[PDB]
Amino acid sequence: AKRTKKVGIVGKYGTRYGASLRKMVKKIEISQHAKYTCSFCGKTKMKRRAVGIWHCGSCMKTVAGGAWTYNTTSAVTVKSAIRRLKELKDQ
């Protein structure tokens, strides 16, 4: 059945810490414990090992990523910017 109406994963915290702090940590805890699909083998086994370290069980590929998400939106725009600058370094 549906066991919790709205708290979701942060039901482990009970009533503590305040509703908005539990809600803020809810989206982070969902992404932090999520299993992403590895872009090297295609298996959905890329999971967080430590903070900033994402490791794939299947292909044993470890990649440095975000603290909670597999890759942060900041570094995504950075990679596009660097690619744009490299193709602009030559003509």
Partner: protein, 149 residues
């Protein structure tokens, strides 16, 4: 331990004797194991390469930037941070960068730096939520945590 930024073990070939050199970089976000990095003047713009800021485009952003030409990385080392190359001048061999605190600084064009932002992302976004989690965070760093007013 005591750091939010992951480290990278990178193995080079020693050029003067038959040996392997094990360096401990600071991981730029996006690097992975079994990936080649290239350090030198002639390296090209890729995430993880270590090349001088003088041989960079006018807007590239760097990860572990030296303060003095010749030492090792000293700036933008904490997780998610980065410097930004602003401008050069071939006269006087200087390069202006934007430090994470927004401070502009003039450094030599021979200062090396990783290309990219340092991994570890937005670690400060998650509320600690617990006196215990702060207790464990500072047990890895130094005896400073319970702060009496």
């Amino acid at each position: 331990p005591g750091r939010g930024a992951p480290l990278a073990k990178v193995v080079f070939r020693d050029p003067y004797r038959f040996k392997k050199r094990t360096e401990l970089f600071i991981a730029a976000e996006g690097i992975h194991t079994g990936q080649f990095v290239y350090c030198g003047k002639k390296a090209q713009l890729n995430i993880g390469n270590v090349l001088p800021v003088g041989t960079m485009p006018e807007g590239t952003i760097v990860c572990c930037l030296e303060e003095k030409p010749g030492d090792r990385g000293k700036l933008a080392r904490a997780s998610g941070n980065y410097a930004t190359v602003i401008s050069h001048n071939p006269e006087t061999k200087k390069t202006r960068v934007k430090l994470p605190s927004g401070s502009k600084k003039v450094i030599s064009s021979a200062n090396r730096a990783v290309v990219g932002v340092v991994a570890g992302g937005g670690r400060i976004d998650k509320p600690i939520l617990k006196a215990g989690r702060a207790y464990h965070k500072y047990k890895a760093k130094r005896n400073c945590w319970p702060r009496v007013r």
